[PDB]
A paper describes a structure:
[name] is a JmjC domain-containing protein, present in both the nucleus and the cytoplasm. Building from an extensive peptide-based screen for potential [name] substrates, our results provide evidence that [name] is a JmjC-hydroxylase, catalysing the stereoselective C-3 hydroxylation of arginyl residues in sequences from proteins involved in chromatin stability (RCCD1) and translation (RPS6). Consistent with previous reports, [name] residues 174–416 fold into mixed helical and β-strand topology comprising seven α-helices, 13 β-strands and 3 310 helices. Like most 2OG-oxygenases, the [name] active site contains a metal centre, which is octahedrally coordinated by an HXD..H motif (H321 and D323/βII, H400/βVII), the 2OG oxalyl group and a water molecule, which is likely replaced by a dioxygen during catalysis.
Except in the apo-[name] structure, the βIV–βV loop, which is involved in substrate binding in other JmjC-hydroxylases including FIH37 and ycfDs30, adopts a partial helical conformation in all [name] structures. However, in the apo-[name] structure, part of the βIV–βV loop (aa 351–361) adopts a hairpin conformation. In the succinate complex, part of the β3–β4 loop (aa 241–248) is disordered, whereas in the apo-[name] structure the β3–β4 loop, together with βIV–βV loop, encloses the active site entirely. Compared to Complex 1, single sidechain conformations for the target arginine residues corresponding to 'productive' (A in Complex 1) and 'non-productive' (B in Complex 1) orientations were observed in Complexes 3/4 and 2/5, respectively. Comparisons of the substrate complexes with those containing 2OG and of apo-[name] imply 'induced fit' on substrate binding involving substantial conformational changes in two loops and multiple active site residues.
Residue numbers in the entry: 182 to 416
The structure:
């Protein structure tokens, strides 16, 4: 089934109907006027920080377990993995562009819906990153509440509740813990028969929209276009 969409709901409505019971929802009209929506482009990023060095994870396939960390400039990442056709797959490690490019911080705002949490102020972790069309983030479980905001490009997202964990064949990976062994969009049901019967929610997230991913929900993502995302994590 699909993720419900709400237009600028009251803080109390979001808290009681979605945050407390742990139900996913897409909030509209909340981030659509961030300056980032009208400013961020590859050109803008390169004008500010193209010469700055960022950590990049490189691997053979988005769904493989072989990943090594490297260091390259923003310009080099864009040239090798976005402008030209790469020989492998790469993504920005840790998704923390705000460390190397603090100038971007002024172009966003923390959604007020995140201060409904028991941890506020410096306890909100904020990540920003961009990546080429086709970037896949394998199905994995999140230890904190999450807002995912699309600035550029569309993303396909699939969500499973923690109640379905057993059907997702979890294991720990060198990169992160609580990852599914299943290829969400082309599952091998001979090896993973329970996956077929797990219900899920899915949506295509577009620029300006915020997806609320409740704590311990499982989520899978694929970038359908060149993508720029911002995520907020809190307890």
């Amino acid at each position: 089934s699909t993720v419900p969409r709400l237009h600028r709901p009251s803080l109390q409505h979001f808290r009681e109907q979605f945050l407390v019971p742990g139900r996913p929802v897409i909030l509209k009209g909340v981030a659509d006027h961030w300056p980032a929506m009208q400013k961020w482009s590859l050109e803008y990023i390169q004008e500010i920080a193209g010469a700055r060095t960022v950590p990049v994870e490189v691997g053979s396939r988005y769904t493989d377990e072989e990943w090594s960390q490297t260091l390259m400039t923003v310009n080099e990442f864009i040239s090798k993995y976005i402008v030209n056709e790469p020989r492998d797959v790469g993504y920005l490690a840790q998704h923390q562009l705000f460390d190397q490019i603090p100038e971007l911080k002024q172009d966003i705002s923390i959604p007020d819906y995140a201060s409904l949490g028991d941890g506020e102020e410096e306890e909100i972790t904020i990540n920003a990153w961009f990546g080429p069309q086709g970037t896949i983030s394998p199905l994995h479980q999140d230890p904190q509440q999450n807002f995912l905001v699309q600035v550029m490009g569309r993303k396909y997202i699939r969500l499973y509740s923690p109640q379905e964990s057993g059907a997702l064949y979890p294991h720990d990976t060198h990169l992160l813990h609580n990852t599914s062994q299943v290829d969400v969009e082309n599952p091998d049901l001979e090896k993973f028969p329970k996956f077929a019967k797990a219900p899920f929610l899915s949506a295509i997230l577009s620029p300006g929209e915020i997806l609320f991913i409740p704590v311990k929900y499982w989520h899978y993502v694929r970038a359908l276009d060149l993508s720029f995302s911002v995520s907020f994590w809190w307890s």
